[PDB]
């Protein structure tokens, strides 16, 4: 899988 973060933030995948 490509990297993600389960933490919700104003913009994701930065």
């Amino acid at each position, epitope marked *: 899988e490509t990297f993600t973060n389960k933490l*919700k933030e104003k913009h994701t995948d*930065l």
Partner: antibody
């Protein structure tokens, strides 16, 4: 790799509704915002709104709030956009786009016509 | 809403020459979290947009080094150090700081030969 795969083209009559899908693969779907964007000649690219699949939080452009409804099915890693009360000005190509517009679907062409 | 004003509207350029596009926003794109949510996208005809630059100056994976992004506040530039034939298309700036998120009108890049 991240893949966003949209549903096929649609021809719908004025006053009707349509639901377009964006099936995702290659990342954990619940962890990235999904946006929807309109592209029409002359109007350019317009952001419709977004949904966070992890909790169903949505943000809409006020221009589209009475027209668009965004949902997700986590079980199939798919995002959906319903557009209602359609008129000719809704004819356009619609895109799903992840996160800060980092990956885009191939587009779905909608034509509103009798 | 935040208006994104791009210039020029058309870029007519020869291979190897440098080129640039500027984007003005009607409100500062600096967010209270310290980030500036400004990106640049390229769309070729009949294709979807692809992101090239994000957070003003960061290059997306697989984007040639010939592309750089700079700026702050309300004023931003996309620079191409030497245009290649495959750079053709329509470039858009877009902002994700203020709701609703908005796009510039697009700059078409065409090649001379």
């Amino acid at each position: 790799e991240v893949q966003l795969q949209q549903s096929g083209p649609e021809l719908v009559k004025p006053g009707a509704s349509v639901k377009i899908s964006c099936k995702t693969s290659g990342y954990t779907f619940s962890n990235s915002w999904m946006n929807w964007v309109k592209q029409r000649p002359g109007q350019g690219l317009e952001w419709i709104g977004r949904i966070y699949p992890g909790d169903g939080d949505t943000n809409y452009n006020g221009k589209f709030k009475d027209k668009a409804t965004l949902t997700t099915d986590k079980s199939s890693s798919t995002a959906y956009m319903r557009l209602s009360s359609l008129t000719s000005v809704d004819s356009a190509v619609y895109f799903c786009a992840r996160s800060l517009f980092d990956y885009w679907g191939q587009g779905t062409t909608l034509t509103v016509s009798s | 809403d935040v208006v994104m004003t791009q210039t020029p509207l058309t870029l007519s350029v020869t291979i190897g020459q440098p080129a640039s596009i500027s984007c003005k926003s009607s409100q500062s794109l600096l967010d209270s979290d310290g980030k500036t949510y400004l990106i640049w996208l390229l769309q070729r005809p009949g294709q979807s947009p692809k992101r090239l630059i994000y957070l003003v100056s960061k290059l997306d994976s697989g984007v040639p080094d010939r592309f750089t992004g700079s700026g702050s506040g309300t004023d931003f530039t996309l620079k191409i150090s030497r245009v290649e034939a495959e750079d053709l298309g329509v470039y858009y700036c877009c902002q994700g700081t203020h709701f609703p998120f908005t796009f510039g009108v697009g700059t078409k890049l065409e090649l001379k030969r």
